[PDB]
Design a protein around this ligand. Structure first.
Ligand SMILES: [Cl-]
Ligand SMILES: [Zn+2]
Lengths: 665, 6
């Protein structure tokens, strides 16, 4: 029922390694029987029910069962369960390629669109046909036989290369040892949480809750250099081999499909359309930020020269890679009076969670309720039920996995577990999402205290959750966040604007000790500090976007040399010799290949919607919030990204709001 | 994965 919750979450999280492997074989056998039955139908025998409906019914049942098998590798605390989940992901990814390249299915779908009356079917069903045909041509099913076999074998190879690329980074356990003197200027609540060694030193891992605080606060330059070297050499040997094979395969596949480069191949499925649009977008933005980067680098060198003189260190007259985050932090303290370690005292995780849920219950017209004794994959995971405030319709559920642990996904993402699409019996499946982040642990007898950047990450990932829950389509392939890659980051970055509003920050903050709110002056300075270090921070994102474009455009290039090239030309901070940042670039194997520009590309759309609609008539306006849910989130992937922006803005988007928020133009 | 730039 659309107004109940019991029985609609069919996800089990107590699977053993043997059950994961058994369910994987069963899922492949049962799914292949559906594709085989459709393939056996005569061409003049296919209809809407025996072909389109039969495939749509198995796509939703497959992706839900697939979720229980390929998700434990990211969250489970049992390494054997994670290994069985990764093997299930490898086996199911090759199966996806086998089914996607069935010529008999392609012929019968093409024949169905030609004979069926497209006017008597839902417009989303029309989109299902043309997308399926377009996906078949992007697999070469209109090409001769032997080239299809080459594409298939190379697709299966790239599948295992991408899985092994992220598997190496997720299971890395590299750590360094430092003494108390080598960890100068680090606070005691960080030092007292590290593992002690036999010689009274401390173990520091390369994970985010350890790497960033060292690179931002530790006043020992050699300590930051050793950390930056180890961080940008993770899996350097094995992942360079993978990149040296994956990138030529992507080019070789794009050639056989008729495309010049792999970047052109993936750009056709994005709102940017062409690579020449991405180049002009990145280059024009890089030129606007060039004066800001020069002024910020000059201020950083002055900070480094004075500190080397005060502390008696040697001064090399340059900004090394291990100096960037350290003096960016000083720029925030000196130019904007912002102490992140003091400001986090006003952001205990329970107050931030309460304010986060309350902000979007009121804005989106939703009702959140935490479930007790919830079936979860880890003890620290909580479950919430989402209802429509007016009708009481149970839209979906989401999990909160907030704290880091061994073997857990170390970045910050949102996972779609169940799509909010239609079921074969006519009912609607309850959407399910999971917010997976690694926030600060509760230490020193205090609750978890989040820095402002962690609060902004909390709002970003919750935007993906709201997109997954509010999306309601007919087909699973259009549900959730199955939109253009350069558009999926619009709902997430849109909700980041609420951590830069004074009244919104006042509802998110309460001191962990005495419960007092943040002072008015400090609250004003926090909002005014939104553009601190924005020159170099954005230039580094352009560097990553240019490297991602270059590695998928030019053939026979050294990944480390191309990254060091743009670091010196664009960012002005040289890459450390001996490192290999592209070997750690997980986006190149996590669906963002040739598409990392989409973050900056999406920010133009989110800033335009926030400034032109929310910021003009109240950012908590329920009318504007409901219009944002129905036009941006609810359609999911059933409409083009540009079409949904047109319906919300009643015009075309432009960079005026984007450039104004960046202090440009 | 479905979340956070580098
Ligand atoms: Cl084949
Ligand atoms: Zn995101």
């Amino acid at each position: 029922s659309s107004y109940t919750v019991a029985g609609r979450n069919v996800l089990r999280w107590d699977l053993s390694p043997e059950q994961i492997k058994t369910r994987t074989e069963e899922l492949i056998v049962q799914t292949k029987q559906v594709y085989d039955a459709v393939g056996m139908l005569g061409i003049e025998e296919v209809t809407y029910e025996n072909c389109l409906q039969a495939l749509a019914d198995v796509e939703v049942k497959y992706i839900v069962e697939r979720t229980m098998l390929d998700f434990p590798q990211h969250v489970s605390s049992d390494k054997e369960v994670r290994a069985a989940s990764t093997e299930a992901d490898k086996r199911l990814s090759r199966f996806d390629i086998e089914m996607s390249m069935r010529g008999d299915i392609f012929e019968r779908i093409v024949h169905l669109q030609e004979t069926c009356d497209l006017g008597k079917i839902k417009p989303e069903a029309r989109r299902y046909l043309e997308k399926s045909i377009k996906m078949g041509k992007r697999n070469g099913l209109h090409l001769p036989e032997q080239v299809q076999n080459e594409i298939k074998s190379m697709k299966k190879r790239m599948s295992e290369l991408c899985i092994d690329f992220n598997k190496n980074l997720n299971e890395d356990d590299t750590f360094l040892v430092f003494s108390k003197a080598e960890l100068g200027a680090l606070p005691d609540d960080f030092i007292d949480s590290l593992e002690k060694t036999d010689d009274d030193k401390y173990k520091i891992t390369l994970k985010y809750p350890h790497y960033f605080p060292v690179m931002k606060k530790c006043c020992i330059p050699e300590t930051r250099r050793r950390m930056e070297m180890a961080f940008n050499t993770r899996c350097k040997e094995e992942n360079t081999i993978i990149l040296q094979q994956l990138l030529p395969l992507r080019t070789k596949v794009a050639k056989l499909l008729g495309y010049s480069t792999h970047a052109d191949f993936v750009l056709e499925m994005n709102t940017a359309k062409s690579t020449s649009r991405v180049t002009a977008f990145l280059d024009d933005l890089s030129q606007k930020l060039k004066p800001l980067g020069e002024a910020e680098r000059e201020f950083i060198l002055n900070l480094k020269k004075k500190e080397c003189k005060d502390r008696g260190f040697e001064y090399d007259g340059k900004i090394n890679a291990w100096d960037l985050y350290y003096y960016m932090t000083q720029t925030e303290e000196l130019k904007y009076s912002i102490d992140q370690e003091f400001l986090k005292e006003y952001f205990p995780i329970e107050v931030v969670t309460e304010g986060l849920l309350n902000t979007y219950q009121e804005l989106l017209g939703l009702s959140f309720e935490q479930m007790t004794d919830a079936h979860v994959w880890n003890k620290s995971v909580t479950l919430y039920t989402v209802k429509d405030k007016a009708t009481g319709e149970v839209l979906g559920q989401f999990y909160l996995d907030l704290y880091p642990r061994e073997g857990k996904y170390n970045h910050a993402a949102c996972f779609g577990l169940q799509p909010g699409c239609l079921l074969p019996d006519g009912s609607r499946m309850m959407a399910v999402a999971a917010l997976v982040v690694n926030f600060s642990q509760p230490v020193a007898g205090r609750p978890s205290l989040l820095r402002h950047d962690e609060v902004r990450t909390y709002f970003h990932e919750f935007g993906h959750v709201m997109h997954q829950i509010c999306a309601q389509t007919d087909f699973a392939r259009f549900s959730g966040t199955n939109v253009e890659t350069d558009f999926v980051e619009v709902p997430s970055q849109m909700l980041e604007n609420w951590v830069w509003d004074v009244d919104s920050l006042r509802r998110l903050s309460k001191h962990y000790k005495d419960g007092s709110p943040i002072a008015d002056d400090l609250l004003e300075k926090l909002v005014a500090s939104r553009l601190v270090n924005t020159g170099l921070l954005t230039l580094r994102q352009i560097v990553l976007s240019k490297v991602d474009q270059s590695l998928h455009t030019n053939t026979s290039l050294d990944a480390a040399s191309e990254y060091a090239k743009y670091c010196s030309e664009i960012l002005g901070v040289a890459a450390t010799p001996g490192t290999n940042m592209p070997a750690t670039f997980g986006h190149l194997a996590g669906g963002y290949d040739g598409q990392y520009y989409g973050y900056l590309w999406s920010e133009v759309f989110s800033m335009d919607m926030f400034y032109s609609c929310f910021k003009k008539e109240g950012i908590m306006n329920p009318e504007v919030g409901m219009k944002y849910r129905n036009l941006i989130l609810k359609p999911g992937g059933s409409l083009d990204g540009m079409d949904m922006l047109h319906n919300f803005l009643k015009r075309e988007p432009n960079q005026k709001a984007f450039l104004m928020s960046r202090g440009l133009h | 994965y479905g979340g956070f730039r580098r």
